Structure formats: structure tokens, C-alpha cells
Short mmCIF file of C-alpha atoms and ligand atoms in Angstrom, two decimals:
data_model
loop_
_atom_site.label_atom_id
_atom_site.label_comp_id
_atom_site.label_asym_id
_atom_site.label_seq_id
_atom_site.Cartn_x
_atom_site.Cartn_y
_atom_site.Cartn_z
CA UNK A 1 0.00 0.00 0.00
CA UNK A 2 1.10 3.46 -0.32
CA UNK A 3 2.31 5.38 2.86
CA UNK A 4 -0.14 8.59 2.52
CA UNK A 5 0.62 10.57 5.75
CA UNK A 6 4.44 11.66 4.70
CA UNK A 7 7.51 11.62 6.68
CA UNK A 8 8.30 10.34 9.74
CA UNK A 9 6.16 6.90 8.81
CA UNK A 10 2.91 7.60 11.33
CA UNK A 11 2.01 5.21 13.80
CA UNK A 12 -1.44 3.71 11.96
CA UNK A 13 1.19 3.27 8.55
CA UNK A 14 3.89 2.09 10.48
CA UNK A 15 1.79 -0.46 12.38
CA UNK A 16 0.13 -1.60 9.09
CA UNK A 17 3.69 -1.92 7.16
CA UNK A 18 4.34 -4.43 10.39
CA UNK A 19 1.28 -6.46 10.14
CA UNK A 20 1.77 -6.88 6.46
CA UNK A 21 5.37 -8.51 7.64
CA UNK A 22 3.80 -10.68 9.83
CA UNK A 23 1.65 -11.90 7.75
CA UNK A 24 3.65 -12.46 4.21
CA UNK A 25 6.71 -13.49 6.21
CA UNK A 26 6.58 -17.59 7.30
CA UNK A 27 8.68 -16.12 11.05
CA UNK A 28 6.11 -13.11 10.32
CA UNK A 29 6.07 -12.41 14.18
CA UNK A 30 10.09 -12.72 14.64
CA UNK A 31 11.08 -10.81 12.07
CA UNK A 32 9.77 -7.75 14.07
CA UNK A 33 10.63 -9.27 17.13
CA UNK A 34 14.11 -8.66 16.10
CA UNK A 35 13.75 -5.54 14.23
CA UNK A 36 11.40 -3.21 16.08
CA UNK A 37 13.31 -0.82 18.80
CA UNK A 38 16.66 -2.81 17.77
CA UNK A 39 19.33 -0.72 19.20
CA UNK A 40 22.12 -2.35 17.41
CA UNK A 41 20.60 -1.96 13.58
CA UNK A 42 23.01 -1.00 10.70
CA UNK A 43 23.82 2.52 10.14
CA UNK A 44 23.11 2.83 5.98
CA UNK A 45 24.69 5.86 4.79
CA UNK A 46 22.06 8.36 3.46
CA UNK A 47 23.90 7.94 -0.21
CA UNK A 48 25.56 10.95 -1.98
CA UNK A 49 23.31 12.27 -4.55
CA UNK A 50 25.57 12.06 -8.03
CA UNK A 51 27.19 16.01 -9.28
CA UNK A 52 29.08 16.24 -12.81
CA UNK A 53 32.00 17.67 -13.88
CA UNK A 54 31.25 19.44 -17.23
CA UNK A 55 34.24 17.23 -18.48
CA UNK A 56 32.09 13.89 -17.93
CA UNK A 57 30.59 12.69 -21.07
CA UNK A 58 26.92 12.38 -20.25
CA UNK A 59 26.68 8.34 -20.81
CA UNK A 60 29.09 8.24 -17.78
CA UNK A 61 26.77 10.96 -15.83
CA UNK A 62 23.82 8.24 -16.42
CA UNK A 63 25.86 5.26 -15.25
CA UNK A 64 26.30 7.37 -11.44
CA UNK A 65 22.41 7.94 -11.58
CA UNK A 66 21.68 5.00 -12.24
CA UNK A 67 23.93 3.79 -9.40
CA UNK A 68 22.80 6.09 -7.16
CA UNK A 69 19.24 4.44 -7.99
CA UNK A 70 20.42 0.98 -7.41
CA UNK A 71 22.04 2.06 -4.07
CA UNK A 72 18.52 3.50 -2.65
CA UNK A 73 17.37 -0.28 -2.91
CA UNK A 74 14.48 -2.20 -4.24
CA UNK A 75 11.43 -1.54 -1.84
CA UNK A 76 10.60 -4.77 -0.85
CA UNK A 77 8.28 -4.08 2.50
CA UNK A 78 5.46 -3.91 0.83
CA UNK A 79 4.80 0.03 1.68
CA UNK A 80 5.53 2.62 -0.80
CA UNK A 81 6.95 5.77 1.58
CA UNK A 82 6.29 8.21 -1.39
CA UNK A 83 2.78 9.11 -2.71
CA UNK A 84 3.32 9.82 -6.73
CA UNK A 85 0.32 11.49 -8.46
CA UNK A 86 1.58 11.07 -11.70
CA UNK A 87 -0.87 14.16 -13.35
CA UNK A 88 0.71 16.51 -10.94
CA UNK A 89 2.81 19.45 -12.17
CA UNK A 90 6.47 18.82 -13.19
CA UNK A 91 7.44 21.05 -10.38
CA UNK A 92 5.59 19.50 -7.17
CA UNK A 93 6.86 16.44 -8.79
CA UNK A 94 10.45 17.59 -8.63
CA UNK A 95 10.00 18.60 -4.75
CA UNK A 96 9.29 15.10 -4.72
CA UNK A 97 12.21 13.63 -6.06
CA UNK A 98 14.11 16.12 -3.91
CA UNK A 99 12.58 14.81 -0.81
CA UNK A 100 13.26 11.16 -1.72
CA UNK A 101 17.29 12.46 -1.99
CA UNK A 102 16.74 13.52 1.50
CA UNK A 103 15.37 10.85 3.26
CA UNK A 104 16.86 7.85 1.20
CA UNK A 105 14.50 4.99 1.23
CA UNK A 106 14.05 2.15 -0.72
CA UNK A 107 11.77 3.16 -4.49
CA UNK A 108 10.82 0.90 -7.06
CA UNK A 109 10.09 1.94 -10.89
CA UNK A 110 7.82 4.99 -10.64
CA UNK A 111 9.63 6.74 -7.76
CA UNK A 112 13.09 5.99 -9.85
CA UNK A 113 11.46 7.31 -12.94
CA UNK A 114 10.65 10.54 -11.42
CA UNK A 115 14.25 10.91 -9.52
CA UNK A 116 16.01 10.04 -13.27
CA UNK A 117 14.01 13.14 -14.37
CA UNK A 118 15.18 15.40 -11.37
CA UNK A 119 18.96 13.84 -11.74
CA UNK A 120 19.12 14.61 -15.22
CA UNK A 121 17.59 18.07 -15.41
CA UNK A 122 21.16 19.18 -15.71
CA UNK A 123 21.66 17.55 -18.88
CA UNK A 124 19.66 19.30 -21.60
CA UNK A 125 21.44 17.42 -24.40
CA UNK A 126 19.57 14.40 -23.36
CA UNK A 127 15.98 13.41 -23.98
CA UNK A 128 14.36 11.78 -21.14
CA UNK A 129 10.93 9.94 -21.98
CA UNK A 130 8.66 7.53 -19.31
CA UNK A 131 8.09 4.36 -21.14
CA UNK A 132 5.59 1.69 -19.65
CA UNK A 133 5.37 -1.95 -20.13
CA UNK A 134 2.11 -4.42 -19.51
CA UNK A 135 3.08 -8.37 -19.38
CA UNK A 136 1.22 -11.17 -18.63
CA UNK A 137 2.42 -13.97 -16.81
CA UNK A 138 1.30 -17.06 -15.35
CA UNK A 139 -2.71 -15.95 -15.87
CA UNK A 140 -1.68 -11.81 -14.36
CA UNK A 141 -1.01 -9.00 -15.89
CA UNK A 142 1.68 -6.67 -14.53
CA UNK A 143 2.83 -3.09 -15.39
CA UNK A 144 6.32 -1.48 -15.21
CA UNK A 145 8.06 1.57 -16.26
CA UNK A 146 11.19 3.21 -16.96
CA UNK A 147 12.70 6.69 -17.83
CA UNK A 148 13.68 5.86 -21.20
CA UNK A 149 16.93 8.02 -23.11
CA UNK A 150 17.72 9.52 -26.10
CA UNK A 151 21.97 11.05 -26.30
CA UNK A 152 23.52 11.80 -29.43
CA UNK A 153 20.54 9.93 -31.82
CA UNK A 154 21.32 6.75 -29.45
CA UNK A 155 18.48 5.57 -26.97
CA UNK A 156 18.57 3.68 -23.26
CA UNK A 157 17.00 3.44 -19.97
CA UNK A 158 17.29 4.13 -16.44
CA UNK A 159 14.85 2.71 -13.83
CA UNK A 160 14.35 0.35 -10.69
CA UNK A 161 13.60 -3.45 -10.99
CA UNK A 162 13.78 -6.13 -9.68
CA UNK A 163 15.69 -7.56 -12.66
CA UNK A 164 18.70 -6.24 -13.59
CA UNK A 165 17.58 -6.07 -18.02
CA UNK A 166 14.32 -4.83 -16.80
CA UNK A 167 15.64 -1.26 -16.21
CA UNK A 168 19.12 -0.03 -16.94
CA UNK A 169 20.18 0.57 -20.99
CA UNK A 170 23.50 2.41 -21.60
CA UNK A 171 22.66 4.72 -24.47
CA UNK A 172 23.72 2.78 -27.67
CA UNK A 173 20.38 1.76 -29.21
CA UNK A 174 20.32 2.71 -32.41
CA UNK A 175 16.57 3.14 -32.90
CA UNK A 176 13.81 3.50 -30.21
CA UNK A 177 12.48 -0.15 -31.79
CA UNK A 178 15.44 -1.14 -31.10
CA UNK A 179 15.32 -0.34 -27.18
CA UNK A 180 12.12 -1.76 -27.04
CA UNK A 181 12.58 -4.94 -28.67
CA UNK A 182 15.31 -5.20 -26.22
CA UNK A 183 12.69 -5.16 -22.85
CA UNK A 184 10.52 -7.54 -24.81
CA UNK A 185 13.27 -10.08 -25.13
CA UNK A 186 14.69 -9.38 -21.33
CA UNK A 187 10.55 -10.14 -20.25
CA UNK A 188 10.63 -13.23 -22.41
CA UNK A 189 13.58 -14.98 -21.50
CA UNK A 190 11.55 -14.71 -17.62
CA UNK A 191 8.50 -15.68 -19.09
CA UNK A 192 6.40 -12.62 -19.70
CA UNK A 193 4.82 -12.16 -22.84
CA UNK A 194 4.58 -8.05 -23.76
CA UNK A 195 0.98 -6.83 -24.25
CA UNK A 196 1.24 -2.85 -24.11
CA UNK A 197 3.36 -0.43 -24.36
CA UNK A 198 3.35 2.95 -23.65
CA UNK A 199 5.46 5.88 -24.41
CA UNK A 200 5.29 9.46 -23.18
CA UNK A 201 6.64 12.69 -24.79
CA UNK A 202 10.06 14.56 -23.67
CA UNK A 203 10.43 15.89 -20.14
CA UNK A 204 11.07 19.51 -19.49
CA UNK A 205 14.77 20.08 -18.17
CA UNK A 206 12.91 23.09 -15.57
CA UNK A 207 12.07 21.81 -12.39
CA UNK A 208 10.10 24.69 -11.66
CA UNK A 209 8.21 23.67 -15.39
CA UNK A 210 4.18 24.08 -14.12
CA UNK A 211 3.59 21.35 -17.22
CA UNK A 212 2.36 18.28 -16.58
CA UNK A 213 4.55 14.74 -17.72
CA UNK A 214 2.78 13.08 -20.81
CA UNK A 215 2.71 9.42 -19.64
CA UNK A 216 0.90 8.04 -22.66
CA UNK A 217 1.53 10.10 -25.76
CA UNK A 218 2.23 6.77 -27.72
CA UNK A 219 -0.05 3.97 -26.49
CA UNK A 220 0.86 0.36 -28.60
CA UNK A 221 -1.30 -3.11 -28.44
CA UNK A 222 2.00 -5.17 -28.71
CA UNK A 223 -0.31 -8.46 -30.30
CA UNK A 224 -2.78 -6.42 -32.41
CA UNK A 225 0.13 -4.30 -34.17
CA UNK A 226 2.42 -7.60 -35.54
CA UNK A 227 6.21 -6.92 -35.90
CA UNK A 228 6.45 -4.62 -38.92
CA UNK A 229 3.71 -2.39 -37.95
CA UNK A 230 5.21 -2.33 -33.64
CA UNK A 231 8.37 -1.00 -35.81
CA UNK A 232 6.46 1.57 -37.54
CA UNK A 233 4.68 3.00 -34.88
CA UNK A 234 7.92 2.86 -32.58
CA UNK A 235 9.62 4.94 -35.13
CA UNK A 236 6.57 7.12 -35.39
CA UNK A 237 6.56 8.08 -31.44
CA UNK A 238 10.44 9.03 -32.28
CA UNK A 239 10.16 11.57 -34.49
CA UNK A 240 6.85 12.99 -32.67
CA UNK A 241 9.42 13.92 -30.22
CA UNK A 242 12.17 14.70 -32.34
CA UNK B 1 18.93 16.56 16.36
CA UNK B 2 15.05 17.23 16.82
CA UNK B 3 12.64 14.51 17.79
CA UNK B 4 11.25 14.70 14.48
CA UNK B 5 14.22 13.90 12.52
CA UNK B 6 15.18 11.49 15.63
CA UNK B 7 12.40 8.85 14.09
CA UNK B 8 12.91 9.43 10.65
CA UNK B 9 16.42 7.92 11.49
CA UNK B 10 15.19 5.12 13.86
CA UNK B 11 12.70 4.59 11.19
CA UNK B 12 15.67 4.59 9.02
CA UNK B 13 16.92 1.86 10.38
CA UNK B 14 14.41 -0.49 10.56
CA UNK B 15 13.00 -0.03 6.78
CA UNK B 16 16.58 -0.83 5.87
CA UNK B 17 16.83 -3.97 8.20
CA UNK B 18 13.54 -4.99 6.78
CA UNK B 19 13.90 -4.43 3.35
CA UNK B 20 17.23 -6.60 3.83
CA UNK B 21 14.84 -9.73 5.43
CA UNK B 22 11.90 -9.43 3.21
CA UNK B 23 14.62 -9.25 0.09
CA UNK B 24 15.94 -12.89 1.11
CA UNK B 25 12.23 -14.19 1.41
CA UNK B 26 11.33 -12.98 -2.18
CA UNK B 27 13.66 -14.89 -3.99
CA UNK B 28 12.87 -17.92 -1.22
C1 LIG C 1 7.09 -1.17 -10.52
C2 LIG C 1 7.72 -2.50 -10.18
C3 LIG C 1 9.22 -2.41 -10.11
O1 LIG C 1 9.89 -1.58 -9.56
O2 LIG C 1 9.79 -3.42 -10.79
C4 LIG C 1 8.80 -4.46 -11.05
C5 LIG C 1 9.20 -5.09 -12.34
O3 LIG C 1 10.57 -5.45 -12.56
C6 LIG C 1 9.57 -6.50 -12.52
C7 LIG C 1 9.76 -7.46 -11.38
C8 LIG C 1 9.17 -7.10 -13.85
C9 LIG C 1 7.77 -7.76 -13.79
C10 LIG C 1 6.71 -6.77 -13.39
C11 LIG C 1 6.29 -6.53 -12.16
C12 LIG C 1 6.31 -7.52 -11.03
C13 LIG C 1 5.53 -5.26 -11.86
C14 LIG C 1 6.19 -4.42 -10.76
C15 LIG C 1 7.48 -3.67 -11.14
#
């Protein structure tokens, strides 16, 4: 569930994150037996948010985000700590990200998609892009996104997942098609078959922009389209933003 | 260091110790 009440945790979420343990967890009770008012826990170090030399070519610069992602971990609890409204203005959603570089807890893929805008503001010769994935799997469907790329006519990603070709792409794609054909692939080879995809338009590079994102500029039906006509409208949604 | 900021780092603490446990069950 998501944590609505913001930062510290309050005591309703908190308890809730802890029953949700309890229950998923087969120990469940020990688990926060051995947790809760521990006072010999590990002290993580609130990591340092990534800052670029203008000598550091900007696929580098991507490589320390997307580190700096990794290193906020994979939110496994089961409680989101940051409420995203995804229709909100570019701006409050900025003061987001912000906040999540201050208090350094574990995201998964919309939280990182919104910090990969914020940590690549700086970088206005790069196109940043949400693209969002719908899979099927074992009678489910399940949804995903990441903060797609675009540097020097070459497209990648940057994201959080829980597998490793289900979010980062160093910018050498040569086509968008290209990029994602590469997701569908990673999702086969663990068994997910690629329904939908969705591509938004490029972000502002002002965090003080009162625009909203534009999730779902490009919206594709992955089985209805075939492979030559997923190509064409792939390449389509690339030069609408070009 | 305020109280405020006092359980965001106990809180801290725990998420991380947590998210560490319920890590190892997810892959099983
Ligand atoms: C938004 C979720 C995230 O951060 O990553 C997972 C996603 O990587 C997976 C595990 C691929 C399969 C899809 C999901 C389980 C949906 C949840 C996202």
C-alpha cells in the first residue's frame, strides 16, 4: 500500500507496514521481534546524490544515476513511503524527487522514474521519456516503467527493478524499436509475454516547469500491431518527439 | 537533532533492516 501521511512513517502506517510482515513473512512475528526498537541496527549511509563535472561525457553521468538508484534499494516491505500522483505538475513532482534524496529509502520503478528526471535536469542534451510496459504472466497482468533516453541519436534506460535487463540501458540503441525490442526479449527470456506499451513525450529540463509529464503520448497493443507495424509505430513516437 | 528527525532515522533503520529480510524471502 502506499504510505499517505508523509515523513516520519505515522504510527497507523507504520503499524500496518508491520502487520503486512507478519503476515507475508513464514517467522512473520520474529522478524519484528528482532527488528522493532533494535538498538544495534546498521547505520546505511544516506547515499551521496551524483554532481558532474562538465568534463564527464553524459553516458558516464547516467551510469552514477543510475547507481545512485540501485544504491537506494528495491522496496521490498510492501509500503511505498512516497505518494506519486503522476498528473501533478512537473514542479511538485520535482520537490518530490528532492525529498526522496533527503530521506533515502528504498523506491521501485515509478519513484526511480521521477528521480532520473530530477537527476538529469542538468543535462539538456539528453531526452528523457517515461516508457511503460504491460506483461502477462502465469494468468496476471503486470505493469512497469522506466525513464527511457535519447543522447547523441542513441536511446537507453534508467529505472528500478527487480531484474537487472528490466531497467538499466546504456545509451547505444540505435533506434527506439530497437530499445524496445530489447525489454521484450529481457521479459521473455523470464517468461512474460509483452501486451502494451506505452510511451510518453520529452520531459522539461525546468524543475520549476508548471507542465504536466505526458505518460501516454504513444499507447501500442504489442499483439494487435504484428512486428512490422510495432516497428512503424515505434519509429513514429520518435520523431513525434524529435 | 530534533525529535522529528530522531524517528525518521530510527525509522531509518528499521526499513533498511527490513527491506534486507523481506529481500531474502522474495527470492525464497
Ligand atoms: C514497478 C515494479 C518495479 O519496480 O519493478 C517491477 C518489475 O521489474 C519487474 C519485477 C518485472 C515484472 C513486473 C512486475 C512484477 C511489476 C512491478 C514492477
Amino acid at each position: 500500500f502506499v504510505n499517505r501521511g508523509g515523513l516520519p512513517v505515522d504510527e497507523a502506517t507504520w503499524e500496518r507496514m508491520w502487520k503486512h510482515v507478519a503476515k507475508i513473512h513464514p517467522d512473520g512475528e520474529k522478524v519484528a521481534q528482532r527488528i522493532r526498537g533494535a538498538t544495534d541496527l546498521p547505520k546505511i549511509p544516506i547515499p551521496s546524490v551524483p554532481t558532474f563535472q562538465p568534463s564527464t561525457p553524459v553516458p558516464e553521468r547516467l551510469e552514477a544515476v543510475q547507481r545512485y538508484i540501485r544504491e537506494l534499494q528495491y522496496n521490498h516491505t510492501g509500503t511505498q513511503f512516497f505518494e506519486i500522483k503522476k498528473s501533478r505538475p512537473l514542479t511538485g513532482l520535482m520537490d518530490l524527487a528532492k525529498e526522496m534524496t533527503k530521506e533515502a529509502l528504498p523506491i521501485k520503478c515509478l519513484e526511480a522514474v521521477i528521480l532520473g528526471i530530477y537527476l538529469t535536469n542538468s543535462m539538456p542534451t539528453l531526452e528523457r521519456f517515461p516508457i511503460s510496459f504491460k506483461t502477462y504472466f502465469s494468468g496476471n497482468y503486470f505493469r512497469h516503467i522506466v525513464l527511457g533516453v535519447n543522447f547523441a541519436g542513441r536511446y537507453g534506460a534508467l529505472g528500478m527493478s527487480r531484474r537487472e535487463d528490466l531497467m538499466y540501458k546504456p545509451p547505444a540503441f540505435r533506434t527506439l524499436s530497437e530499445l524496445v525490442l530489447d525489454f521484450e526479449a529481457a521479459y521473455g527470456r523470464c517468461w512474460h509475454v509483452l501486451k502494451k506499451v506505452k510511451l510518453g513525450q520529452s520531459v522539461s529540463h525546468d524543475p520549476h516547469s508548471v507542465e504536466q509529464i505526458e505518460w501516454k503520448h504513444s499507447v501500442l497493443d504489442v499483439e494487435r500491431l504484428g512486428r512490422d507495424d510495432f516497428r512503424k509505430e515505434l519509429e513514429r513516437h520518435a520523431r513525434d518527439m524529435r | 537533532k530534533s525529535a522529528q528527525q530522531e524517528l525518521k532515522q530510527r525509522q531509518r533503520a528499521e526499513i533498511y533492516a527490513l527491506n534486507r529480510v523481506m529481500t531474502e524471502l522474495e527470492q525464497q
